[PDB]
Design a protein around this ligand. Structure first.
Ligand SMILES: [Zn+2]
Ligand SMILES: [Zn+2]
Lengths: 222, 471
DNA sequence: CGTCG
DNA sequence: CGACG
């Protein structure tokens, strides 16, 4: 969708287009999406977070110009935002909402870390199945969606195509096929969902979540 | 079929055949949302001599250089066929043979490319006319040309062209029916798959603009007519000229140049032509009295009708073969509209300028053909603006669109009890009308009776005309 | 498969 | 689209 991309390296295998050295796994990396000459599709050109600013890319605003920014850890978002550079009720409520955002971010991340600590990939797949959720490709996305469901609830299927929705940077986009020819394009910040249900098998580890369900609701960018 | 030259083996080898099935596939994949417009070409090549076999893949974006290819030599023919079929099934989700193909999401769609005595005694004008309408060199050129802007991936079988035709009719039905935007997107994706377009690297647009849709429908109908003409050419001791004459099922005669009916025809042509929207003049060459087989019978119900008039019709010369074979025909109900303003029916004009503009003659072929028809109009339903009608009002036999210019009615002429509007172009007192020249329309094929057919040179006003006219 | 180009 | 862990 965007031009720039930022994420934690899903594999320690991509070579930086600047220093031509292996980018390690789970490390912060930034790509520029460039058209490919080999096939009809864009491809990410990956750089170490350091190398990326030495190529003179003048990113004005990361939160908007970079896809996947809204999904990084908080301190890493702050780092990317700083490096991209080198009225009472209004401002007061502004600061308070910022703190709430940090809360939700660090929350989801602690959840994902606990999960990866105790569960296996197949355990997470089973958690998704039990809650009537589609199992995506890639361990990262698997536990991302497990956390989404546990925080806000088992997403209910799409109203039209009947496919699962997934959270994107700005909204819950549907990922289903309205037909073999064209894909569905529903989006909404308020998707219907039933309550998340951990199978009883994982109860011993669900106390390893200490409940703490909370009544949170997804906070979306302005 | 053709060996893709990106393999460098079109002369060293040839595409392989087996079980009455060819091993060359051309698949398209489109998503207007993401903008993807991709092509995948797969071939199995066999050396013209030995048991040497190759698998050739190529892929990329239509009408661009984005993409790549790969050539593998296979150790045997069986391994090559397995490789081919498994690649096909990977890229399309279906098997290599199947009566019922089913589109699968994110998968490519297959495209149906189409590859590949002398004792006459007729008069010479008629022989030249037959040589004109049954011309094979021009037909084969127009059939299997190489225009990578209209056909970026080769000639399309008539089946797929009619499929896209019906898809466009459905698009128009939708736009009418307060449609879902997604109902339009599905048809847009399907169309742009069935008909590859060179859009460089821009996202293909939606079929919302109904005018461009009318245009694409006109293009597809032209291709269909050309396919029909080619299939008609492929119909001994008799001379080929008589052989092709017999296909017409029409009796042809040559009116004498110095005849009287001929001079009346010439006065018609001269008066009713207008150099205002036509950058050329008309010159008659040969007149032809035509009598179609059986058409003389189906018109009898209307010969006792009133207000029968002798009017013009003009189409490209390629179709004229068919036009004498099966008379004038109306469009089907499932076809879309291509620009006509008054529904599907037989159209005529009262001024040779208008009907001749529909010959689409070129400066390279100043010749064109044009028909004269006794059409039984009866009661005229007269309209000033477009109207896709279905039922004639109770009591009407035909429709007339009123332009701002018309032959002088005071100059009318009666030939065999048939009015002829050969007057000069004057202004009609019709206010607030959109047409420039009149249009006549009937909706029953039997209301037309072809009487004459003209060969005409379109003398264009180029440097040659400019010298001959300024000296 | 799930990465990467 | 292929290539590769
Ligand atoms: Zn680097
Ligand atoms: Zn949907």
């Amino acid at each position: 969708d965007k031009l720039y991309r930022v994420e934690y390296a899903k594999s320690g295998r991509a070579s930086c287009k600047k220093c031509s050295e292996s980018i390690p796994k789970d490390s912060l990396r930034m790509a520029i999406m460039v058209q490919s000459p080999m096939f009809d599709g864009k491809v990410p050109h990956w750089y170490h977070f350091s190398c990326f600013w030495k190529v003179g890319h003048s990113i004005r605003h990361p939160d908007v110009e970079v896809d996947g920014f809204s999904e990084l850890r908080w301190d890493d978002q702050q780092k990317v935002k700083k490096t991209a550079e080198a009225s009472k009720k209004e401002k007061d409520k502004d600061s308070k909402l910022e703190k709430a955002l940090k809360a939700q971010n660090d929350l989801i991340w602690n959840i994902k870390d606990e999960l990866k600590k105790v569960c296996s990939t197949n355990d997470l797949k089973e958690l998704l199945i039990f809650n009537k959720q589609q199992v995506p490709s890639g361990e990262s996305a698997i536990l991302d969606r497990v956390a989404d469901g546990m925080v806000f609830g088992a997403l209910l299927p799409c109203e039209e195509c009947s496919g699962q929705l997934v959270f994107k940077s700005d909204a819950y986009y549907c990922t289903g096929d309205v037909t073999a020819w064209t894909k569905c394009m529903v989006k909404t910040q308020t998707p219907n969902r039933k309550e998340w249900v951990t199978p009883k098998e994982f109860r011993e580890i669900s106390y390893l979540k200490k409940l703490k369900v909370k009544k949170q609701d997804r906070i979306f960018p302005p | 079929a053709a060996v893709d030259p990106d393999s460098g083996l079109e002369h060293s080898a040839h595409v392989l055949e087996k079980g009455g099935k060819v091993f060359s596939a051309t698949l398209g994949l489109v998503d207007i949302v993401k903008g993807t417009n991709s092509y995948y070409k797969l071939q199995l090549l066999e050396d013209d001599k030995e048991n040497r076999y190759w698998i050739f893949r190529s892929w990329g974006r239509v009408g661009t250089v984005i993409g790549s290819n790969k050539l593998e030599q296979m150790p045997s023919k069986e391994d090559a066929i397995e490789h081919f079929m498994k690649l096909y099934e990977e890229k399309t989700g279906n098997a290599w043979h199947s009566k019922n193909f089913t589109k699968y999401p994110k998968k490519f769609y297959p495209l149906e490319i189409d590859y590949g005595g002398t004792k006459s005694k007729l008069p010479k004008p008629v022989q030249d006319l037959i040589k004109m309408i049954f011309d094979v060199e021009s037909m084969k050129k127009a059939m299997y040309e190489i225009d990578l802007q209209k056909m970026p991936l080769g000639k399309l079988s008539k089946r797929q062209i009619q499929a896209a035709y019906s898809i466009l009719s459905e698009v128009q039905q939708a736009v009418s029916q307060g449609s879902s935007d997604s109902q339009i997107l599905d048809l847009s994706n399907r169309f742009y798959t069935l008909i590859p377009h060179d859009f460089g690297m821009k996202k293909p647009p939606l079929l919302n603009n109904a005018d461009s849709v009318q245009a694409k429908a006109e293009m597809l109908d032209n291709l269909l007519d050309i396919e029909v003409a080619y299939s008609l050419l492929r119909g001994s001791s008799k001379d080929p000229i008589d052989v092709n004459y017999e296909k017409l099922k029409t009796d042809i005669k040559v009116v004498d140049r110095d005849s009287e009916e001929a001079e009346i025809i010439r006065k018609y042509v001269k008066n009713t032509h207008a150099t205002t929207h036509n950058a050329y003049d008309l010159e008659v060459i040969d007149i032809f009295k035509i009598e179609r087989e059986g058409e003389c019978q189906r018109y009898k119900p209307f010969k006792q009708l009133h207000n029968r008039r002798l009017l013009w019709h003009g189409s490209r010369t390629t179709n004229f073969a068919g036009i004498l074979s099966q008379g004038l025909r109306i469009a089907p109900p499932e076809a879309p509209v291509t620009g006509y303003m008054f529904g599907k029916g037989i159209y005529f004009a009262d001024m040779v300028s208008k009907s001749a503009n529909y010959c689409h003659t070129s400066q390279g072929d100043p010749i064109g053909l044009i028909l004269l028809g006794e059409v039984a109009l009866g009661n005229m339903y007269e309209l000033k603006h477009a109207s896709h009608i279905s039922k004639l009002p109770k009591g009407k036999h035909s429709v007339k669109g009123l332009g701002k210019t018309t032959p002088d009615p005071s100059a009318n002429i009666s030939l065999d009890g048939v009015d002829v509007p050969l007057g000069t172009g004057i202004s009609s007192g019709v206010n607030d009308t959109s047409l420039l020249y009149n249009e006549y329309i009937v909706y029953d094929i039997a209301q037309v009776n072809l009487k004459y057919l003209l060969k005409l040179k379109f003398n264009f006003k180029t440097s040659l005309w400019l010298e001959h006219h300024h000296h």
